[model samples]
Target chain A: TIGKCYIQNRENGGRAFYNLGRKDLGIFTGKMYDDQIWSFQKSDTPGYYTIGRESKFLQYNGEQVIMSDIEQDTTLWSLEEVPEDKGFYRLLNKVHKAYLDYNGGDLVANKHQTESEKWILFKAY
Target chain B: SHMSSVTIGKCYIQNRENGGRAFYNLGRKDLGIFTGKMYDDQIWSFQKSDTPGYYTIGRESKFLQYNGEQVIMSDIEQDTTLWSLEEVPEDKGFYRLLNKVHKAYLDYNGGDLVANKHQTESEKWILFKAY
Candidate 1:
């Protein structure tokens, strides 16, 4: 819940994991590689967390979603779980009012809570 | 600078000559410049060149080229775009990036990238994998 882990979408079961290459965020097959790992930790604000690797944090710009060293309010994230979908959560950008989502294309930030928004974090050993 | 599939694709080109004073900036494809706190405009990609055992470093669209001077980001992949990445014999995993056309190594100047005929050990580069 509060450390390094791999993120998977609820739709893909545990098969698809978050994969970051350069600045592009997408999904990969499993947690076998280092690129699929991410750090999920609490931020300065309560009820929110930050997802990143090394020194960079996950950020959502109007144009695209990418990893960045610059920490902004919009980069903070909160998880909202839908009751019907247990163990699944929607990753909401605390200040930006968008959800980290993927629609069979590149990873993107969407305003609406679509099916692709649900993400679950598993602690990394 | 290390040659491997994992190290290929997009990356942040860190110049030892700059002492990390300024990093390669990106998102603008027009020019390869240095900037403040990064990992941002720092994205560049590597591609296999026409020559044997060489590479062509580029961004999303353009390739890197330098004459007897500045390393310019060019839309056209000419002879100047050819380069060879050699790992530093002393420093494991580190590399010496040489532009074949310029007959020099890629080094950082005041704020831009230039080709230097000679540089000490501190002038090598490390390609931090991006993609």
Candidate 2:
């Protein structure tokens, strides 16, 4: 048995730390804090981040621009270029010159049609 | 001469004849009035809202065609960025006026301006544009 103690284990009653997903923290949460503890100490990198994910912009044949509103669940949350704009502190990597393919639909259990779906990137701080 | 437009609040128009005016409505049975003056250019007729000057009606146009028929319009709504009447940059065919308004209010799709809360008599009206 080790006599030396881990302060976090005792301070947290052996439970993992959590901020409970407060929106006031904006994009950062307890899970984010844990994932970004080391990143917090590191300085922000000043460049466009390429996470190797393919996205596109579709404004076809005098039509409205449509894109997917997918959830952000990527392995790499890139710290892209930061802008001096008001409100938005950082401008995430612009997804440029990506592939373009119209998807009719994906085969789900109920054979749902996703014909009205395109993928795109967003500016996240 | 008569015309129609929207008013986010009540208005003080050139409420006489020859100069046309009508209140903005959300296609409802219950409605309040928004008053302004109308001017006709080559193609578009615009109305300028007055008072504190927050909203202007550049062109209170119905996208469809009608000839003096009172259409029971459905699904009427006001967007925040919709332009209001205001002073025209052009002079030859333009209209401008002043008005006093109450606290802004609205109802969507057949509802009247309910729970009216007018500002104090001392509180001045404001006019804005829908950009």
Candidate 3:
């Protein structure tokens, strides 16, 4: 219920098996290059699981937690870490657009300074 | 001393037999003037001769470079911005180097020029008013 990423199988809350959303114990920790979203842990429990790389999410009190160990057989909801300010999001979007435009060869010819043509004046009007 | 040596362009101010004049290279190990010369304006002509159009006139000394070009002469347009001669002493003449063109005075050796392709090491002029 807290900032924890939800595991689909609510029935497998307590006993340890293989939690779907949280970090897989047997499997190597999958380091997502993307930003952080949320984390879920219990008060009595020491270890917590992170959902996003950019925005930090922490588990809150009264959050539904495992009595013992988290079960592995659960579905995971993956959400990208986003900035609090909408303007920052818009800026990132614009940068992405520009990157696409540049890579697509739209503005390639506009990149050099060449201004050395001579001009002579004739009789004044 | 009325006699002064003659140099064409921005030369080193060295004391010479004719009079103290400018040097072409200025401050070489052997050719630099330890003591500067005085150009007490004797009769160094610019227009009549085939030298460049600029003339640095003092008492009897000047420095000229080979960069002289032919141009109009004997034309003194209205220029009231020159400092008053009265303020300076009678014997001390201004360092007026003549250039044939409108703004022909070449102030190459002053503090403004450090090192450039056109300017050599020499070309510093001094006023005798100061000790």
Candidate 4:
């Protein structure tokens, strides 16, 4: 079913949705915006993908995630399936070597050594 | 939020904050699940979307979607998607469908379902478990 999901936080369990931030990605308790439907389309390289909603892809600028047109390599990512857990997926950057993270509902890209970081761990429905 | 489904029927009732009437789009034949149901067109299967507690109600694949003040059944789109379902313990299987964007609930008046400004008895709904 297109691997569609709600992208929920493992901590507060808030569903992630694109809030169209001015500079950073604004995440809130899951709501509308293309039904919060995201797809991890496999990129040209195997195992790599582009996390996208209806018309925009999640572009990380080493600080935060934003909805923008796919214009650079920053949009490509690697979705790593967490071990022992089929529902949780780790979104790794293709270039930054960082994981997609959130800080108090703000989306970011940070280097997290452990998969236990609840902000970086996303569960699919 | 826990995910689940329910059936809409007559004489069913519920109460909550920011209530509105549950109805459907007669032109598109999509169930509103929160508006006034004058007939069977208001009957629906409140199926949970991928998001927990958020539901889409309608027949087949076409679900009732929100757009401004209108909820219609059609293709899944951005502005017309996702609703929060909160279970109310006052009644058996009664719940409130909260609009995630508008922070509103479905209310009822006579047979017309509407979006009420506040949550009250008129906004709640009684759900029959449908297999």
The best candidate in terms of DockQ: 1
Q: Could you give the CAPRI-style class of model 1? A: incorrect
iRMS per model in Å: 16.1, 27.2, 40.8, 14.6
lDDT leader: 1
Write candidate 1's Cα lDDT for B1-131 as tens digits. 22221125665565543324223334543353343233344567778776677788876466777777567777677777878887777654457788886668876655666677785554577564432
* TM-score of candidate 3 on Cα atoms, chains taken together: 0.17
- TM-score to native of every candidate shown: 0.45, 0.20, 0.17, 0.43
What docking grade does candidate 3 earn? incorrect
lDDT of 1 at B131: 25
> Against the unseen true structure, what C-alpha lDDT does each candidate score?
0.64, 0.22, 0.21, 0.53
Candidate 1 lDDT by residue in tens digits, A1-125 = 77766566655422123444554456643223456568788888887888877577888876677777867787798888856655568888877789988756467789997877777565543
> lDDT per residue, candidate 4, A14-108, as tens digits?
44566444343455542223344476566666657777765678777776677768636888877676664434566778778887766677777
The C-alpha stretches of model 3 lying farther than 4 A from their native spots are A1-125, B1-21, B25-91, B108-131
- DockQ, all candidates in order: 0.03, 0.02, 0.00, 0.01
> What does each candidate score in C-alpha RMSD?
14.5, 20.8, 32.9, 15.5
Native contacts recovered by candidate 4, as a share? 0.00
TM-score of chain A of each: 0.85, 0.17, 0.14, 0.72
Candidate 2: what's its TM-score on chain B? Answer: 0.21
Q: How would you encode candidate 2's per-residue C-alpha lDDT over A46-116 as one tens digit per residue?
A: 33231221131111111211222232221112232213211111212123222222222110111122211
